[PDB]
Ligand binder design. Structure first.
Ligand code: HEC
Length: 360
């Protein structure tokens, strides 16, 4: 066992795994203790076997499993398809262009604070049906949560907001609006409760901004430091979708948890153990991704699981992809050449509280 803190950065996960993993996992004695799976095949299998690796608070749909979870996903699917993402892409594109245009003349920006976070949140609000006049309010909630408004009142403010949104749509339902649609939903033969409605809307808010923003930021930070890759992205548009997938692989950092239900789970765990599924290890397994630390837009096999796999695979994957690609497209139209302030120091992986300054 090792005294390993699961709040560690991806690089730390990978170093600890390199030194301590055997049989596809290492064990942490920290806190209540937990296993960390370290292989692509083992993590994929765990995501795909909920009878062995359980997800079971009530956060819809993240913490429910079985037939009720499948029914929630069926009801939600229409608002999160690739076709819906395409339908919304002219709005996403105009959003990116408007925002980047407003700071091109400065020659600098704090990428995530001034651009990516309000961009992504605006896009989320459009998809979910939250009035865009509320963006500044919701942005303040989101920022207070990152910087943990403040730690005490941020989440209560979000809870009041979703309660008020439900009440707005119940008074004036809108055809095609997600919240309005849920007033007609049944799950397991029972009308959806306002408590589950509020849970769903809360999960969408908490899931739908930060991961997208930080993938946008870590990707542009790499391009700003690597002129060869920047030039490739700029001059070879056909490679851009592959580049987005390669950055999703490389910049993965979530570590979804599961509860082992049986002896020998994953080859290593026992009944009652917490098991973590770090995407920073799955997506860097050299058995599947040779030279895993290398950003290679031409990587021939990129079966990454940046969005998970199995039944809980990210609902927002198509929408996140559209936002990242579109933002980087519009960025390179207006700002084809750019750099980090000191372009020859190795920058850190961006997570939690950071300030990504780009100049041009
Ligand atoms: C517009 C909403 C939205 C966006 C954008 C979004 N997500 Fe998700 N994500 C969700 C929801 C909702 C779930 C829960 C799905 C479920 O439990 O069935 C989820 C689940 C996941 C999971 C699985 C967690 C588990 O326990 O299995 C991963 C991993 C994930 N998202 C990664 C990402 C990444 C990476 C991005 C952006 C680069 C992203 N998500 C963007 C809504 C979103």
């Amino acid at each position: 066992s090792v005294e390993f803190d699961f709040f560690a950065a991806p690089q730390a996960y990978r170093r600890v795994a390199a030194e301590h993993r055997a049989d596809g996992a290492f064990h942490s004695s920290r806190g209540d203790s937990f296993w960390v799976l370290s292989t692509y095949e083992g993590i994929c299998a765990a995501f795909r076997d909920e009878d062995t690796f359980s997800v079971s608070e009530r956060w819809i749909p993240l913490t429910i499993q079985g037939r009720t979870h499948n029914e929630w996903r069926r009801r939600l699917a229409a608002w999160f398809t690739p076709q819906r993402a395409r339908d919304l892409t002219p709005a996403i594109r105009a959003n990116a262009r408007r925002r980047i245009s407003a700071f091109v003349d400065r020659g600098e920006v704090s990428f995530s604070d001034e651009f990516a976070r309000p961009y992504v949140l605006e896009n989320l609000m459009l998809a979910v049906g939250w009035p865009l006049a509320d963006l500044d309010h919701l942005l303040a909630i989101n920022v207070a949560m990152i910087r943990s408004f403040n730690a005490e009142t941020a989440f209560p403010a979000l809870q009041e907001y979703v309660r008020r949104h439900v009440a707005r749509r119940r008074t004036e339902p809108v055809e095609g609006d997600l919240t309005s649609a849920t007033f007609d939903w049944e799950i397991d033969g029972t009308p959806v409760s306002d408590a589950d409605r509020e849970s769903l809307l809360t999960v969408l808010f908490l899931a739908g901004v930060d991961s997208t923003v930080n993938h946008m930021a870590n990707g542009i930070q790499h391009l700003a430091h690597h002129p060869g890759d920047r030039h490739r992205f700029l001059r070879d548009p056909e490679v851009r979708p592959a580049a987005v997938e390669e950055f999703l692989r490389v910049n993965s950092c979530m570590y979804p948890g599961r509860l082992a239900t049986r002896e020998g789970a994953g080859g290593v765990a026992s009944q009652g153990d917490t098991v973590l599924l770090p995407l920073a290890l799955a997506n860097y397994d050299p058995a599947v991704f040779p030279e895993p630390e290398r950003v290679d837009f031409d990587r021939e096999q990129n079966p990454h699981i940046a969005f998970g796999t199995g039944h809980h695979q990210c609902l927002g994957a198509a929408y996140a992809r559209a936002q990242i690609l579109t933002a980087w497209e519009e960025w390179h139209e207006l700002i084809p050449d750019y750099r980090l302030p000191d372009p020859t120091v190795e920058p850190p992986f961006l997570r939690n509280v950071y300030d990504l300054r780009i100049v041009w």
